[PDB]
């Protein structure tokens, strides 16, 4: 209940409820020992909204995202996405001509060694399960 | 013994003979007795009052004289003095000012890992009161949200001093990242893009980027150099290392023999 | 040892070639074009004919192992 109510307001872009959840359950959040969220969740809410847009959309204008994130400033919309690409929230690009924010390339996985990198982590790990299970089983 | 307690500190400190006399004062206190057991006995707590006071004024002298390796040095002497086993020695009013100087200096070093691991020794001194600690954690909150404008409007807002050596390193550690964020595959932009990405209406600062780096102002047009390479063609580097990965499988499908 | 006989042939080709690049024994035109179609008929792996199609059977055989 202090956490299902927490992740509800973290998911949406609502803050007045999120300040209500935090102020009401702040005594619980200090007692259990996780009061290191107070500085680390204002970053999360402002990056959740830009992550949801970049996952949904593919080519959005900076004026369109600035009004979508209730920010009322089309001059730091370039600054938010610049911090998003720098922190690695989404791989995108900003064309600083008229507001083009484009998405990635066409997704090809099975043709550029990517299944090999996932599988090579599996082969060497599961034979290590086998080598540990061989050197435990025999006794007199 | 009680040598130059409060000299020229209230008004100015232009002299450097004060520094060596304080240094001789830092000798004699450590020549008296060591602070290492630190159990009880208020008599030796009296010289712990004096030793922590002569370093806090030594920290104020160190930040005044533009000295970076000493300001971390005198603070580490004080922070090891705040680390006491049997903590006693009641509340000095310069403590909350001193941690604000350390934490803002740590924010200026680009130490985001050390910034948060320090913030445990203050239970409720971050939200209710103590604007000296509240001002960096409001500032760090501004860097994580993404509002550069809120950073510099609060730059002219300090409780005690001007925070001059702290904001200038803060001015340094932002713009190189802003220069690091704009040096990309971008070819050219006009002056009005550097009016928004960068700042003020034609200072000597754009000369500094023109004399150090490129960004040559020509016919009202900047020119940022940019290129890209091309590499999907190399199956050869996943030829050698894949042949190693396939054999080290078959090396290990046997050999516990 | 399938490859130990490979370079033993390849050392033998240049040994006769440097013997005739010097010019001690006279040439045979018969072996020249018989050697020349070796070098302009080896494959060259560039793009979309190998690097696509090689992973299509390499990421295939990594599923069954």
User: Mind giving me the DSSP string for chain B?
Assistant: ---SSS-TTSS----SHHHHHHHHHHHHHHHH--SSS--S-HHHHHHHHHHHHHHHHHHHHHHHTT-HHHHHHHHHHHHHHH--SS--S---TTHHHHHHHHHHHHHHTT-HHHHHHHTTS-SSTTTSS-HHHHHHHHHHHHHHHT-HHHHHHSTT--SSS--HHHHHHHHHHHHHHHHHHH-SS-----HHHHHHSS-SSS-SHHHHHHHHS-----SS-----------S---SHHHHHHHHHHHHHHHHSS---
CA distances (Å), B83 to each of A78, B27, B34, B38, B89, in order? 45, 21, 15, 11, 12
Inter-chain touch C65–B249, beta carbons under 8 Å: yes
Q: Tell me whether residues C65 and A111 touch, CB distance under 8 A.
A: no
- Which of B125, B142, B146 would you mutate first to test chain A, the one with the most A CBs within 10 A? B146
Contact A34, A14 (CB under 8 A): no
**Between A and C, how many residue pairs show a Cβ–Cβ distance under 8 A?**
24
Say whether residue A108 is in contact with chain B using an 8 A CB cutoff: no
Q: With CB atoms and an 8 Å threshold, state whether C63 touches A119.
A: yes
Q: Is B249 in the C-facing interface, judged by CB distances under 8 Å? A: yes
Long-range contacts made by residues B156-160, C-beta under 8 angstroms, separation at least 24?
A: B159/B100, B159/B131, B159/B132, B159/B135, B160/B97, B160/B132
Residues of chain A with Cβ-Cβ distance to C53 below 8 Å are: none
Cβ neighbors of B175 (< 8 A, separation 6 or more) are B198
Structure tokens at A135: 């050197």
**Residue A101 contacts residue A93 (beta carbons within 8 Å):** yes
Chain C contacts in chain B segment 219-248 (CB below 8 A): 232-233, 235, 242
CB-based contacts of B214, cutoff 8 Å, min separation 6: B223, B224, B225
User: What is the four-CA torsion angle of C4, C6, C8, C9, rounded to 10 degrees?
Assistant: 160
- State the Cα–Cα distance between residues C16 and C11, nearest whole angstrom: 9
Q: Helix (H, G, I), strand (E, B), or coil: what is residue A37? A: coil
Q: Do A134 and B147 touch (CB under 8 A)?
A: no
CB atoms within 10 A of CB C19: 11
- Nearest CA to CA, how far is B20 from chain A (Å)? 43
Mutate one of B128, B144, B243, B253 to test the A interface: name it (highest A CB count within 10 A): B144
Query: Chain C partners of A115 at a C-beta cutoff of 8 Å?
Result: 55, 59, 62-63
Q: Considering only alpha carbons, which residue of chain B is nearest residue A130?
A: B253
CB contact under 8 A, C65 and B233: no
Our CA angle for A112, A118, A120, nearest 5°, is 105
Judge: C56–A115 Cβ closer than 8 Å, yes or no: no
Sign of torsion, CA B190 B195 B199 B203?
positive
Tell how far CA B38 is from the center of its chain.
Answer: 31
Distance from CA of A124 to the nearest CA of B (A): 7
Q: Please tell me which chains touch B, using 3 or more CB pairs under 8 Å as the contact test.
A: A, C
Distance from chain centroid for Cα C27: 23
Q: For residues C65 and C62, what is the distance between their CA atoms, to the nearest angstrom?
A: 5
Which of A82, A84, A118 should we substitute to test contact with B (largest number of B Cβ atoms within 10 Å)?
A: A82
Chain A residues lying within 8 Å of B189, measured CB to CB: 96
Are B140 and B107 a contacting pair, CB within 8 Å? yes
Nearest CA in chain B to C47: B233
Work out whether strand A59-61 and strand A93-95 pair parallel, antiparallel, or are unpaired.
Answer: unpaired
Query: What is the separation, in whole angstroms, between the first and last Cα of chain A?
Result: 53
Query: How was this model experimentally determined?
Result: cryo-EM
């Amino acid at each position: 209940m202090p956490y299902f109510l927490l992740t509800q307001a973290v998911r949406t872009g609502n803050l007045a409820k999120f300040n209500q959840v935090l102020d009401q359950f702040g005594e619980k959040f200090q007692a259990d020992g996780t009061y290191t969220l107070i500085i680390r969740l204002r970053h999360n809410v402002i990056k959740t909204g830009v992550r949801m847009i970049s996952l949904s959309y593919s080519r959005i204008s900076l004026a369109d995202i600035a009004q979508k994130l209730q920010l009322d400033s089309p001059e730091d919309a370039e600054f938010i996405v610049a911090k998003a690409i720098r922190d690695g929230v989404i791989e995108a690009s900003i064309n600083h001509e008229k507001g083009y924010v484009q998405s990635k390339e066409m997704i090809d996985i099975y043709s550029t060694r990517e299944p090999q990198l996932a599988f090579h982590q599996r082969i060497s790990f599961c034979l290590d399960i086998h080598n540990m299970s061989v050197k435990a089983m025999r006794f007199p | 013994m009680y040598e130059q307690l409060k000299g020229e500190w209230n008004r100015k400190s232009p002299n450097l003979s004060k520094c060596g006399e304080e240094l001789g004062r830092l000798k004699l206190v450590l020549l008296e007795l060591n602070f290492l057991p630190t159990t009880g006995t208020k008599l030796t707590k009296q010289q712990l009052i004096l030793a922590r006071d002569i370093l806090e004024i030594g920290a104020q002298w160190s930040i005044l004289r533009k000295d970076i390796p000493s300001f971390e040095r005198y603070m580490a002497q004080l922070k090891c003095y705040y680390f006491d086993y049997k903590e006693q020695l009641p509340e000095s009013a310069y403590m909350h000012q001193l941690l604000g100087l350390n934490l803002l200096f740590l924010l200026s070093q680009n130490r985001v890992a050390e910034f948060h691991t320090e913030l445990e020794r203050l239970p409720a001194k971050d939200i209710q009161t103590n604007v000296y600690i509240k001002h960096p954690v409001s500032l760090e909150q501004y860097l994580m949200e993404g509002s550069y404008n809120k950073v510099f409007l609060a730059k002219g807002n300090i409780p005690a001093e001007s925070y001059t050596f702290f904001i200038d390193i803060l001015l340094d550690t932002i713009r190189d990242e802003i220069a690091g964020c704009i040096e990309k595959a971008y070819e050219k932009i006009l002056f009005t893009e550097a009016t928004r990405i960068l700042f003020f209406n034609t200072p000597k600062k754009m000369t500094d980027y023109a004399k150090k780096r490129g960004w040559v102002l020509g016919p009202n047009n900047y020119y940022s150099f940019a290129s890209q390479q091309q590499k999907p063609e190399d199956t050869t580097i996943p030829s050698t290392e894949l042949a190693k990965q396939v054999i080290e499988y078959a090396r290990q499908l046997e050999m516990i023999v | 040892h399938g490859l130990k006989g490979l370079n033993s042939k390849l050392l033998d080709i240049r040994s006769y070639l440097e013997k005739v690049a010097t010019g001690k024994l006279p040439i045979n035109h018969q072996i020249i074009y018989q050697l020349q179609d070796v070098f302009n008929l080896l494959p060259d792996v560039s793009l979309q004919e190998f690097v696509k199609a090689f992973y299509l059977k390499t990421n295939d055989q990594m599923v069954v192992v």
